[model samples]
Target: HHHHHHMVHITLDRNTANSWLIISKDRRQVRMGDTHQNVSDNKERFSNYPMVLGAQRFSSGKMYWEVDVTQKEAWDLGVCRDSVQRKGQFSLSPENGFWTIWLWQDSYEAGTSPQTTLHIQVPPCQIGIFVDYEAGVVSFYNITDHGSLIYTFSECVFAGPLRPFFNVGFNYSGGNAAPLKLCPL
Candidate 1:
């Protein structure tokens, strides 16, 4: 996926559920000049997630995703289940300052998964996420942070093929407003 100044190239097929290039939950509701408000539940559930494009079942090895979110303030760009509400398998929104991107080896279980983050004042200008399925690792990077390597997880791995999802919804905790896109890339 290509947006703004970031270009991403990866594989999403039967081996692995899917992949995406989208906005974050923080950008769903309020526009560029709206008063800051707490997030909503419905919007939080719908818009603040990974907007999936292509997914299947058997993807392995080093997978890459690059995104340019300079125009965005609060958002999340990561992978999650196609049916986030169903299984409740989702990653943390980058909107949270120093967001933690979690990957569950099994379905999400409190205190049983691994997470990492890239420090850059919540919403980063540009970023990249790499998922090494075989190695059971997920790493975060910041472009403006001098390509600063942020964090990494070496355990709590994801097994089998998991469906890919994405979302950059704004004001998710309010009314689930703004643009939401889900498709095959």
Candidate 2:
């Protein structure tokens, strides 16, 4: 069974999002920016990509958080190392500190070094990201479909703190305009 009792509240860090990303005032939702709003530059922000990190960083024990992707057609869900370079282009793989599962069109894929394609019977509207820091494992679940298992990354080398990662997909789409929501746990 892909179950965990550790549930944590997650919030997107506004300071870490790229200029093109727009986070809600409550800091629980994030989406692609369409308007040219005044965005203050930050050295810690992602400069090359439109992604955001969680305000909380986990260093030990089990942690789980669910994200609402119901309104989005494409998105990225999982955890990332705290030290991963956010300023420039970086690889999206476990070796590069990104352990994620991405959805594009009607298919899902594990963001591994070799890229593993995932086939789930149900299209998930919400994604549950679970991390066992001490055990070096990260798993994604289809929360909208009875919390079914989606993909898992085992034997991870988690030497540092990990941050909950989120991405609004690689490209733009009219249907993907819905913000990725952080579910209340």
Q: What are the lDDT scores of the predictions, listed in order?
A: 0.39, 0.85
Model 1: lowest-lDDT 10 consecutive positions: 103-112
| Cα lDDT over the full model 1 | 0.39
List runs of model 1 lying over 4 Å from the truth.
1-58, 81-118, 121-123, 172-185
lDDT of 2 by residue, 74-143 (tens): 8878889899888877878987889999987788999987889998998888898889988999999988
The regions of model 2 sitting more than 4 angstroms off are: 1-4
Q: How many clashes does the backbone of model 2 have?
A: 0
lDDT per residue (tens digit) for residues 74-93 in model 1: 44444543333422444343
How many Å off is the CA of 164 in candidate 2?
0.5
**Model 1 residue 4 lDDT score:** 21
Error of 1 at 87 (Å): 8.0
